[PDB]
């Protein structure tokens, strides 16, 4: 793997770039269509964990507009995008 016959390989022709962020390892994006796995109306990081939507070691969560929400939820400690927020309050929930 990565051997071109002696010609310097592609991954060594090219430069390394970037650094790896530890903050991104604990931030979980949550789709609106995954919320049917939640028990109750409150949507917090703990509730997402017990629904298994996010890993149990995730510290932060972000709710993004991917599917649709079928009931009214109360998002407490999560970041909500613009379209996700409008869809949430169109279904009748609130963000705090």
């Amino acid at each position: 793997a990565g051997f071109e016959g002696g010609q310097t390989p592609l991954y060594r022709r090219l430069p390394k770039f970037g650094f790896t962020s530890k903050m991104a390892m604990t931030t979980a994006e949550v789709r609106l269509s995954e919320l049917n796995k939640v028990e109750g109306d409150v949507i917090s990081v703990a509730t997402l964990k017990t629904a298994n939507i996010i890993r149990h070691d995730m510290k932060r969560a972000r709710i993004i507009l991917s599917g649709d929400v079928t009931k009214a939820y109360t998002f407490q400690g999560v970041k909500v995008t613009k379209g996700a927020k409008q869809a949430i309050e169109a279904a009748g929930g609130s963000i705090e």
């Binding site: 793997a1 990565g2 592609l10 060594r12 770039f17």
Partner: protein, 64 residues
């Protein structure tokens, strides 16, 4: 358990995009006075990995 090992040096050069891999371009490290500003502009930023090279990239970074 035995697993496939990533090419850790290839992972530092290639990143996953939706339908391919992105990469930086070569010839930007040093020797940059003589280079035209068009080349300094156009060698900056991300390219996509070539379709002929993405098989090797997949063989090298099997978990990305």
């Amino acid at each position: 358990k035995v697993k496939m090992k990533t090419k850790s040096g290839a992972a530092k050069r290639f990143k996953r995009t939706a339908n391919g891999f992105k990469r930086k371009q070569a010839f930007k490290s040093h020797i940059l006075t003589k280079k035209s500003s068009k080349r300094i502009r156009q060698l900056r930023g991300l390219k996509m990995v070539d379709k002929s090279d993405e098989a090797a990239v997949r063989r090298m970074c099997p978990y990305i």
